[PDB]
Amino acid sequence: TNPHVAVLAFPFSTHAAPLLAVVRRLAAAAPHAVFSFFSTSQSNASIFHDHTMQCNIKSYDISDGVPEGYVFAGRPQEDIELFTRAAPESFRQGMVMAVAETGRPVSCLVADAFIWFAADMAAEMGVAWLPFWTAGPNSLSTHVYIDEIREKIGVSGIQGREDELLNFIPGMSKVRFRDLQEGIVFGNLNSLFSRMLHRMGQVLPKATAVFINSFEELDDSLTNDLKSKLKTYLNIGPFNLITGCLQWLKERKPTSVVYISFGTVTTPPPAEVVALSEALEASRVPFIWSLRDKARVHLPEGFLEKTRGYGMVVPWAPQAEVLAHEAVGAFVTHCGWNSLWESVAGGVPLICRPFFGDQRLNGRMVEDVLEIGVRIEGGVFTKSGLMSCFDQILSQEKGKKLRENLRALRETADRAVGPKGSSTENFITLVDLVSKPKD
Numbered sequence: 001t002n003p004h005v006a007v008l009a010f011p012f013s014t015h016a017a018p019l020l021a022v023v024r025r026l027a028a029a030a031p032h033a034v035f036s037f038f039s040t041s042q043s044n045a046s047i048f049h050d051h052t053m054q055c056n057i058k059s060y061d062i063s064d065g066v067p068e069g070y071v072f073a074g075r076p077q078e079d080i081e082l083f084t085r086a087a088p089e090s091f092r093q094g095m096v097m098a099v100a101e102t103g104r105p106v107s108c109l110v111a112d113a114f115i116w117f118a119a120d121m122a123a124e125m126g127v128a129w130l131p132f133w134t135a136g137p138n139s140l141s142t143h144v145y146i147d148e149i150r151e152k153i154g155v156s157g158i159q160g161r162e163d164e165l166l167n168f169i170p171g172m173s174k175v176r177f178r179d180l181q182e183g184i185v186f187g188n189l190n191s192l193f194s195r196m197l198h199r200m201g202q203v204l205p206k207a208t209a210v211f212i213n214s215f216e217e218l219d220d221s222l223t224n225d226l227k228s229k230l231k232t233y234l235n236i237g238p239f240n241l242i243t244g245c246l247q248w249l250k251e252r253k254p255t256s257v258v259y260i261s262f263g264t265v266t267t268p269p270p271a272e273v274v275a276l277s278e279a280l281e282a283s284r285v286p287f288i289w290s291l292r293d294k295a296r297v298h299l300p301e302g303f304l305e306k307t308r309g310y311g312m313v314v315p316w317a318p319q320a321e322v323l324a325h326e327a328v329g330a331f332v333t334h335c336g337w338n339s340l341w342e343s344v345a346g347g348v349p350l351i352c353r354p355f356f357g358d359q360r361l362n363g364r365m366v367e368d369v370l371e372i373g374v375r376i377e378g379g380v381f382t383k384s385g386l387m388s389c390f391d392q393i394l395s396q397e398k399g400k401k402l403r404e405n406l407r408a409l410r411e412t413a414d415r416a417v418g419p420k421g422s423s424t425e426n427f428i429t430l431v432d433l434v435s436k437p438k439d
């Protein structure tokens with residue numbers, strides 16, 4: 001038969017949405033192929049919200065892995081653990097349904113890199129395995145190098161060595177030991193999530209091709225190194241350059257507003273919430289703060305009332321549109337990959353407060369490599385540190401330089417995704433791979 005591409009999403013944080021975005025581009029490029037998109041019912045409901053969807057894509061709801069009478073212990077990553085333990089069976093049962101509906105065997109397996117066992121499912125089915133790394137090439141590299149990093153550094157702690165450099169890994173000359181993701185050489189190395197990512201790192205070199213929402217020219221040496229470690233390595237982004245709040249912003253002066261958000265699975269600790277509120281109020285800087293409604297309990301009494309004239313606190317913002325708005329002059333961020341590229345699209349300097357995963361590597365890239373943002377003194381929010389960052393960016397020479405660097409970076413990125421761009425050519429390659437029928 002003609003192709004039937006099974007797509008296996010990771011249904012937590014911002015993973016399923018970028019994967020659907022690529023699938024949409026692939027379905028338009030390969031109109032003869034059918035695509036079956038597997039995630040949980042909650043994930044699909046969110047990302048498929050709303051007549052524009054390519055007719056050759058259909059979503060399928062798979063199990064969240066939670067047993068019927070289950071009582072949560074309240075561990076962190078408990079939902080992830082439940083989903084992950086059931087996922088091999090959950091995805092298999094989804095694909096069975098899609099094969100019966102379409103009458104076409106699965107010819108290709110696209111999956112979030114996190115679904116490491118997708119490699120084994122693909123080998124069993126006799127089809128290509130095409131993992132999507134949803135974050136940056138920095139974190140991809142450290143994952144692919146996990147064994148070597150562990151061998152060089154050891155796994156009994158990095159006490160006294162936090163600021164030592166990872167300069168023995170290509171493209172990582174400015175990354176310190178402390179910048180590494182949890183599960184590499186520190187954190188709970190025996191957790192299910194740590195073991196998952198360890199195996200992923202090992203099996204990624206076996207993929208038909210690994211693809212990523214970045215552009216090759218972000219770092220030539222890193223790109224070259226990854227092409228040496230992987231069978232085929234395809235930069236196909238940035239996606240965002242390819243494809244109440246706004247009314248309020250209309251009346252603000254250019255480059256005057258601070259936007260604040262910490263992604264989809266973080267809130268700063270309550271003391272840091274207080275600290276930001278104090279900095280906003282003391283500077284009287286116009287602001288839009290994306291803050292979980294549940295977390296509003298942590299705002300100092302009177303904060304909302306004193307800032308009503310110049311700031312909004314909302315449970316969800318149209319973030320990409322806010323960052324592209326001329327009134328916005330800075331972005332206080334956890335340094336998640338998707339947020340970073342939206343800020344680059346908008347030409348808005350970052351104020352970085354990374355928490356976990358790849359965010360410290362991304363913060364290092366932003367501050368020391370690309371120079372498109374600044375660090376917060378001590379890596380935690382304080383009233384004085386934040387006030388200094390706002391001044392540096394909105395009112396001082398530093399902000400002009402960061403804006404200049406952002407312009408140049410965005411132009412390079414634009415050319416990667418234009419006609420004859422490196423990401424354009426790489427995407428053709430990926431289309432060719434997903435278009436192949438089964439052996």
Ligand SMILES: O=c1ccn([C@@H]2O[C@H](COP(=O)(O)OP(=O)(O)O[C@H]3O[C@H](CO)[C@@H](O)[C@H](O)[C@H]3F)[C@@H](O)[C@H]2O)c(=O)[nH]1
Binds near residue numbers: 320
């Ligand atoms: O009020 C809001 C708030 C957010 N959004 C949108 O949600 C997305 C957040 O993506 P981002 O990658 O920055 O953060 P997060 O989901 O925590 O990332 C995880 O996944 C990332 C990629 O895998 C990884 O880099 C990171 O470390 C992880 F935490 C981004 O597209 C925002 O525009 C919004 O529209 N409105």
Ligand SMILES: O=c1c(O)c(-c2ccc(O)cc2)oc2cc(O)cc(O)c12
Binds near residue numbers: 012013014077181265
């Ligand atoms: O979604 C998540 C995610 O992507 C990452 C991550 C881990 C290593 C990386 O290199 C990059 C990202 O960690 C997480 C940790 C959580 O407790 C919950 C999550 O949802 C994520």
